[PDB]
Each structure stands twice: as C-alpha cells, then as structure tokens.
Amino acid sequence: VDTCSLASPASVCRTKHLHLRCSVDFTRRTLTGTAALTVQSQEDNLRSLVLDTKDLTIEKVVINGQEVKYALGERQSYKGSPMEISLPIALSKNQEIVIEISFETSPKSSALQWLTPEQTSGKEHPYLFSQCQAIHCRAILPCQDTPSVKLTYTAEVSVPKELVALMSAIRDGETPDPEDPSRKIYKFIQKVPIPCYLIALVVGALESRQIGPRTLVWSEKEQVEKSAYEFSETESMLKIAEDLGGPYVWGQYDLLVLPPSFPYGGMENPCLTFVTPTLLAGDKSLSNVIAHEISHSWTGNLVTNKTWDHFWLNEGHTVYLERHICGRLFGEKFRHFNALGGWGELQNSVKTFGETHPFTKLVVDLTDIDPDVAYSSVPYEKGFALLFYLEQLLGGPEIFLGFLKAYVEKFSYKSITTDDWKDFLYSYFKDKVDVLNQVDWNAWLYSPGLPPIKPNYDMTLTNACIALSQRWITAKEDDLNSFNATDLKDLSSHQLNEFLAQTLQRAPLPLGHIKRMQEVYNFNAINNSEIRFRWLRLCIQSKWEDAIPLALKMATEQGRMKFTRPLFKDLAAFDKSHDQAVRTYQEHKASMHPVTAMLVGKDLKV
C-alpha cells in the first residue's frame, strides 16, 4: 500500500481512463473544468471510494447524469484532503463506471507555477507549467494519486487564443473555442497507460523546430535556435536507448525547454520531456540529462515504481541506462568517469544527511514524509552503484544489459516493488544464484550510509582531475605562482567540473588560493551551469565576498533546485551574506515555484 496517497488502493478500484476538459484562466490563476474518471471496481458490492485532492474546490460529482453525494475529509498536510464519493449503485467486481467531477484548482496549487509576462522571455504573455511528480497531480484534479495505478487519458484544454497548450500526450488538433472566440481548444490523446504523476501541461507563447525524425523542440522563440543545437544528439540517443531498452512505444519524443524556474534538470513526461534552460551551455556538454530523460521512456514510464518507497527503481535504472548511452556515444572510459563522479555525489549526499540518516537508505519508508523533503541523489546514485556493482559481479555490461532488456519486457505497463525486481533478478540469473547470494541485500537495500561495497572504476579520465585538485589543496602561498591557464589545456568541461567537484569536497580552501584560481583560470567567465554552480559554491564556502552577488544572481535568476537550494544554504551559512540571502529569498518567495519556495524556506529556516 501507498502511504503517500489517501485514495482507495488499486486492490479496491482502478482508474482506467481520464477525460480532462478544462480552461486555463490566467486572470484568476485557476484551472476550471471536469475530470471524467473511468473507474473499474476490483471488489464485489462497492458503494463508495476515495480520491486524493489538494487545494481543490469541488463544485459537483456526477454519475449517470445525476449529482451524487461526496465529502472532503480534513486536510492531512502535504497529502491534501481525501474525497469520498458515494456511488449511486453498488458495483460488482470489474464493473466500470464514469465519474465526472467538476472542480477548480487554487492559485497556490503545488503542482503549478503561474508566470507573469515579465517572468518569461517574450515579456508579452503569461505562462503556465505543471510538475506532478511525486504527489502533486492531486493539486490539479481529483485522482488516485498513486503510481500503483495506470490509466490512459484524453484532454481538451481551452486557453487564450494567442497561447499554445501542450501535454504529455499526442497532439490531437486545435480549434477556436465555440463558447469564447478569444480562446482556442487544444486536444490531446495518451493511448499508453501511465501513472498519474506523468500527466503534464504547459500553456505559453511556444514555438517549435524539428530536430529529428520524431522530435520537435518547443520553447519561447528566444530559445528555439539555441535549443535545437544543444539537444541535436536526441535522435542518436533514442536509437541507442531503443537498442538497449526495446521499442520506443510513445510515438513522438518532443522536448520542451522551460522558463528558468523549472525545479528539475528534466521531467520524463511521456511524449514531451520537460528540461531546464540551464542545459543550454552552447556545447551539448549537459546532454546526459537528455539521455536520462530518454531512458525513462522504459525505466519509470513502462516499468514504474508501485509506491514512492521504491523510487530508486525508477531512478537507479535510468541512471544506469543513461550512462550506457553516453558510454556508447563517447566511450567506456567516459562511462566509468561518470559512474565514479556519481559515487562522489553519493559521498556528498550521505555526508550532508549523515551516515545513519533514514533518507540514505536505498528503499525508504515515506510514511509521514513529504517525498519533496526526502528527494535527493541517493536513489539515483546508490541505485546506480548497486546496478554497476551487480554488473561487475554478474559478468560485465553486455550480460547485465541482457537483464535490463528482459526486466523492461517483463514489467512493461506494470507497477513494481523492490521485491518484484529482486525476484526477477534471481529468476533471470538463476545459474548465478550463488554469486547473487554473496550480495549483502539487507545492507544495500535497507541500511543508511555509503554502500557496503564500492564498484571498481577505470581511472583514466579522472586522474588528471584529482592530480590538479591535489595540487591546489597541498599548495602553500609560494606555490600559487606556478599555477597557470595551461593547467586546464587538456581538460574537457566534464573534467573541469570533476576537478571542481574534487576541490569542493575539501572546501574551504584558503581565500588566497581561490583568488588565484580566478586570476589564472577565469572561472567567473564560464557559463556552464554545472561548473559555475560548483565554482560559486567553492567561493562562498571559502569566504570570498566578491562571489556573494554572483551566487545571489545564479540562485535567483534560475530555480533548478539542484542549484538554487545549495547556493542559498551556502550564502546563509556565510556570515557576510547571511542577511542578504534571507532578504533575497523573502522578496522572491511569492514569485518562486511553490515546491522550490517551500524547500528553500525550510533550508533557510525562515
């Protein structure tokens, strides 16, 4: 059972389909309309059922053309309020009915960010985008807000006619709204059963450019050209992913580049991946994020975690495929380089949380924990470390990739637990059970802290990064002169980033050393968001005041939680920038993404 959901479980009733008919009201910041849920009873004599909601206003519930009784329970914090519907006629097992709910969202919907014209690129039009993962779909429409349930959907979305609506679905046409000529209705169809966290909507002044046989890139006009270039590897990555994962079942693979406050690097909404514009480095260097979102088309979207306790299933497998795609494009040494970088990120997380902290277990117990609060690198990197370790244990990448493909096949269109995965791992590798029985399962899966075993990593591309980082760490004042721009000559941007990641692990460095780095390496001039992020962190943590306005600017001009949260925390912990950091948050708070605002607020204790 799903402790993040207040809805009737899948063992009671299942949503098969949603027809969503809504209007986007920019003047009121509400979505208004009907969610028609096709529900199948799993039980004899079913007379009521419960849906998740959050900050919704229910007008009425209609079954068989008549209003029926419903009640909203008290709010349960971030879970929202359960909505019990009285069925007018007891259902037998497998009977299906359509339940039509008239609802309206609140402006404060935790699933939505509403932007003014000024917060966009064009400055002329407002913009709406959704983000449902993990449990924010309830803040858009009444539903069984649990990934243990999969449904197809259709939608009709009325928006101001000058704007464009897109969803996580195939575009099924547009017409003028008959009820309001200032408006357009966009239509959408999603034929593949999906968990409701994959429902996605954007409305804004969007244009598109084709970048591959099955990929358009969407954004405001100011970002189209740059986006078409940055993500031009998309088709190549899709083919590799299809080779590894099996058929891509989703029809199109489009990309939407969001405004800068989108809270994640990307979101694998089916048919329409959402990405942060912080990927726009000019050189495709951040394309692993595309590979990652592509990989979710199998791991996460076909095979889905049954509850959020098993999020690692979604994320570790996706990181694993992600790194294989990048390894195929750029080589097995690169794959190892990234794998090892990932382990460093896990070291960071476990250090931050504390080695005994519950959120450092692979499988977590989210009972009374907001998934947004528990979210971190752990399920990604500990999940990946487990798979990379098993890969090495079980006979190498070719062999474990055979398992991954069989695993996807086996659990397509299904929702699964860690036990489901482990059972199938044993089934698939039954000739290797003795080897599998050497794994310390309880530790890997259920214990806090770093994994009990570290995989083996090729060091070829890492060595130079460590060597340089060690030079800076061990340098005394009389050694600073010897540093020079040519130190970086043979380092790729990835290596620059790992160099900085290495150094950041030992921060603070002395202020003089950091001043010299800028003098010789000019890191202030690098716009690569990953590098600039780590660089600014190293500056603020080494107490360099000049870096304060640079850190405040990055923290607020984009809102990728990966970058925004630790910049604010760093600024808050630096006594010289502490008050300004708090002040800056308070000023931007109302205009921030509601999830990002809530978490930064917690981080800052304001």
Ligand SMILES: CNCc1ccccc1-c1cccs1
């Ligand atoms: C005022 N009528 C438009 C409307 C109101 C409430 C909910 C939905 C709608 C839609 C019309 C067309 C697509 S949604």
Ligand SMILES: [Yb+3]
């Ligand atoms: Yb010396």
Ligand SMILES: [Zn+2]
């Ligand atoms: Zn992911």
